[PDB]
């Protein structure tokens, strides 16, 4: 239970909900066929389009509720420790990031922090240790212009049952300058890219003594591999 609700650009805080299409509650999306998978449940929208340069260091901030912790010493801020899983980021090129319909876009993955089997560390573990932030660079080669930037937490604490993996998604509206001429060889659809039977979605992450360590096995994130310039 958490909401992606703020972006930073090379460390500069763009402000709460600035440029975001974000849900207004922290409940998960669980039906991978839902249009809610694209940018989360329909919630707040913003007219701002965040100016970024290709290659920039982007931060995406999750907190338990809109605005931060739900109450003093909230143990589930930025997200409950139990919610082990990967974090993924995708781009979709759009003409106008403020007015584009979220439906039917052509998505490609640019980054993910999944599971390190030898350290037993999930992307959500790093999110927690970075106080809700996940950091990644925009590719240096992507073309100039508007994009939606979709960031997604996949929490697997209940994912051993069909349709009970939990998704926490929002989209940021950005304009890229200083880019290159990259065109993705392949794109995917949301909804569509994920199937409930995917081995990173229908998964029992619990080991011998009940710890969520994936039995020290490698984990396969759903969707396509991140592009590289």
Residues in binding site for Cu(2+): 1, 83, 168
Nearer to Cu ion, 49 or 80 (CB): 80
* Smallest separation, CB 28 to Cu ion (Å): 6
User: Would you say 26 and 83 are in contact if contact means Cβ atoms under 8 Å apart?
Assistant: no
Question: Minimal distance in Å, beta carbon 129 to Cu ion?
Answer: 18
CB of 26 to Cu ion, least distance (A): 7
* Least distance in angstroms from the C-beta of 168 to Cu ion: 8
Q: Cβ-closest residue to Cu ion?
A: 1
- Smaller CB separation from Cu ion, 77 or 187: 77
Residue 65 CB, nearest approach to Cu ion (Å): 12
R_g of the chain computed on alpha carbons? 17
Q: Single out the segment in contact with Cu ion by CB under 5 A; choices: 1-9, 29-37, 47-55, 194-202.
A: 1-9
Binding-site size for Cu ion (CB under 5 A) equals 1
Residue 30 is a binding residue for Cu ion (CB under 5 A): no
Nearer to Cu ion, 1 or 57 (CB): 1
Please provide residue 71's backbone torsions phi and psi, each rounded to the nearest 5 degrees: -170, 165
The dihedral over CA atoms of 35, 36, 41, 43, expressed in degrees to the nearest 10, equals -40
**What is residue 121's three-state secondary structure?**
strand
Cα distances from 87 to residues 135, 175, 200, in angstroms, run 10, 22, 12
Phi, psi of 134 (to 5 degrees): -120, 140
What is the rounded CA–CA span in Å between residue 59 and residue 136?
7
What are φ and ψ of residue 14, in 5° steps? -85, -5
Q: Which is nearer to Cu ion, 7 or 65 (CB)?
A: 65
Q: 1, 53, 57, 106: which one contacts Cu ion (CB under 5 A)?
A: 1
Residue ranges that bind Cu ion, judged by CB under 5 A: 1
């Amino acid at each position: 239970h958490a909401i992606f609700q703020k972006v930073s650009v090379n460390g500069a805080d763009q402000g709460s909900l600035t440029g975001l299409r974000a849900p207004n509650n922290n409940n998960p999306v669980q039906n991978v066929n839902s249009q809610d998978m694209i940018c989360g449940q329909s919630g707040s929208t913003s007219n701002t389009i965040i100016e970024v340069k290709a290659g920039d260091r982007i931060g995406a901030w999750y907190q338990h509720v809109i605005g931060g912790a739900q109450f003093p010493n909230d143990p589930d801020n930025p997200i409950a420790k139990s919610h082990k899983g990967p974090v993924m980021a995708y781009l979709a090129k759009v003409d106008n990031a403020a007015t584009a319909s979220k439906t039917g876009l052509k998505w490609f993955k640019i980054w993910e922090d999944t599971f390190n089997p030898s350290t037993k560390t999930w992307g959500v573990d790093n999110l927690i240790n970075n106080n809700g932030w996940v950091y990644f660079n925009l590719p240096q080669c992507i073309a100039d212009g508007n994009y939606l930037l979709r960031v997604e937490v996949l929490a697997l604490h209940s994912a051993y049952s069909q349709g009970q993996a939990q998704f926490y998604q929002s989209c940021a509206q950005i304009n890229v300058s200083g880019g290159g001429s990259f065109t993705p060889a392949s794109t995917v659809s949301f909804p569509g890219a994920y199937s409930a039977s995917d081995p990173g979605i229908l998964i029992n992450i619990y080991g011998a003594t009940g710890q969520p360590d994936n039995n020290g096995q490698p984990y396969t994130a759903p969707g396509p591999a991140p592009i590289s310039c």
